[PDB]
Amino acid sequence: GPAVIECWFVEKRPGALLLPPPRPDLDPELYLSVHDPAGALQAAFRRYPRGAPAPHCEMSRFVPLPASAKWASGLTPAQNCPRALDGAWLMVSISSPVLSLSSLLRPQPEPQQEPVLITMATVVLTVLTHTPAPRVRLGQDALLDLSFAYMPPTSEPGPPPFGLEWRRQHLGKGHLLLAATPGLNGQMPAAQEGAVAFAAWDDDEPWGPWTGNGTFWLPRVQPFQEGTYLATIHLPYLQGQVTLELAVYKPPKVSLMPATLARAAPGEAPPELLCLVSHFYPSGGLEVEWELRGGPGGRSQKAEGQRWLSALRHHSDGSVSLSGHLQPPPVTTEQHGARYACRIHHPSLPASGRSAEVTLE
């Protein structure tokens, strides 16, 4: 994967993360040589798809501070700031269609270096997700992947208690769906919509660093659960946040009525054909095409006759249905054996669409 990552520092200033090539174009208090003890940040970009676009990166000044929510207060019992967190911090936000990551770095006081002018920085906490734009089938369970890694102050038991929070946000209005602080028995907010999470440290080795899981499990997703999901990992005074964009979808089932046609004499018109486009989502982008296959004009010609569309039918699960209708013209003898079909197109379907046909006699 990428060796360096162009980044923007905000409060823009150009910066870069080096996962040493000189860079007179950068600060270099904004040119970071990344030491990642826990390894999550480096492992994420080692897997990065080759030739994949450069990921978006934002850098900013971070100030350790107790979590604001009261449920997380348990992580910070003592009423005083740890000295081990003295020194400046930078929060790194990386997003792409491949992943969405957040990191807390501790850069050295001064840039200087014998080989090249660059600032040494150490990765303390990494929060990552490999499903930044999940697409779950309506009625199915959604598993929003989440992993993290923490490197404790080597200035001084097993991995410490931590906090995990998942919420769905919309227009500054956020709804907490799940919260936990594994390793610290406390009063947690009620889990919503049947959600649960695999929140835990991957192992309990003596000194660390450590990696952990926090993937969210949302049962039988419906269209109203569609949207922006924020996941936050908490450590005393430290927090990392990632954004996921959940899309719900359901391809339509296509069928015709009558399912089969009886024999008919020339100049006679077949019965109105009904193309049922059932239980699909989103409602938009549904297109209906009527064709006459295997006829006196190639095995694909646009059908003739009157055609129309039903209004949308709305189901409780949020999916929708609709009907296409076609009144074919009087049948010719040179149409015998040909089939009338409806070609359905919808973003949740292949390029060729989905069809249903009936044979003429």
Ligand X SMILES: *[C@@H]1O[C@H](CO)[C@@H](O)[C@H](O)[C@H]1NC(C)=O
Cis omega (within 30 of 0) on the bond before 28?
yes
Q: Counting contacts by CB under 6 A, is residue 147 touching ligand X?
A: yes
Asked whether position 200 contacts other proteins by CB under 8 A, the answer is: yes
**Does 78 interact with other proteins (rule: CB under 8 A)?**
yes
Closest CA relative to residue 317, chosen from 139, 142, 135, 143? 139
Binding other proteins by CB under 8 A: which of 133, 139, 198, 294? 198
Residue 18 within binding range of other proteins, rule CB under 8 A: no
How many angstroms separate the CA atoms of 226 and 218, rounded?
11
Residue 360: φ, ψ to 5°? -90, 155
Q: Should residue 70 be labelled a site residue for other proteins when binding is judged by CB under 8 A?
A: no
Q: Exposed/middle/buried for 192, CB within 10 Å: 0-12, 13-18, 19+?
A: middle
Decide if residue 239 touches ligand X (CB under 6 A): no
Residue 3: CB atoms within 10 A of its CB come to 9
Which one of 114-122, 190-198, 245-253, 256-264 is the stretch in contact with other proteins (CB under 8 A)? 190-198
Q: Which among 39-47, 122-130, 173-181, 318-326 is the span making contact with other proteins, rule CB under 8 A?
A: 173-181
Stretch that binds other proteins, among 77-85, 268-276, 285-293, 294-302 (CB under 8 A): 77-85
Query: Using the rule CB under 6 A, which residue among 73, 96, 140, 213 binds ligand X?
Result: 213
Q: Residue 176 interacts with other proteins (CB under 8 A)? A: no
Binding residue (CB under 8 A) for other proteins from 183, 227, 305, 353: 183
Does residue 100 bind ligand X (CB under 6 A)?
A: no
- Binding of other proteins at residue 81 (CB under 8 A)? yes
Taking the complex as a whole, the smallest distance from the CB of residue 201 to ligand X amounts, in Å, to 11
Could you say which of ligand X, other proteins, none residue 83 binds, taking C-beta under 5 to 8 angstroms by partner kind? other proteins
Q: How far apart are CA 359 and CA 328, in angstroms?
A: 13
**Binder to other proteins among 25, 51, 53, 63 (CB under 8 A)?**
63
| Tokens 């303390």, residue located | 124
Residue 147 interacts with which of ligand X, other proteins, none, CB < 5 to 8 Å by class: ligand X
Which amino acid, one-letter code, is at 133? A
Three-state DSSP at 140 gives coil
CB-based burial label for 139 (10 Å; 0-12, 13-18, 19+): middle
Neighbouring C-beta atoms of residue 8, cutoff 10 Å: 16
Convert 272-297 to b/e letters by CB count within 10 Å (16 or more is b). Answer: ebebbbbbbbbeeebebbbbbbbbee
Q: CB 212 → ligand X: shortest distance, Å?
A: 8
Angle at 57 between CA 130 and CA 63, to 5 degrees: 100
# residues near other proteins by CB under 8 A: 31
Tell the residue number behind the tokens 């309990």, with chain if given. Answer: 204
Residues that bind ligand X (CB under 6 A): 147, 198, 213, 215
Residues that bind other proteins (CB under 8 A): 63-66, 78-84, 86-87, 178-180, 182-183, 185, 187-188, 190-191, 195-200, 215, 217
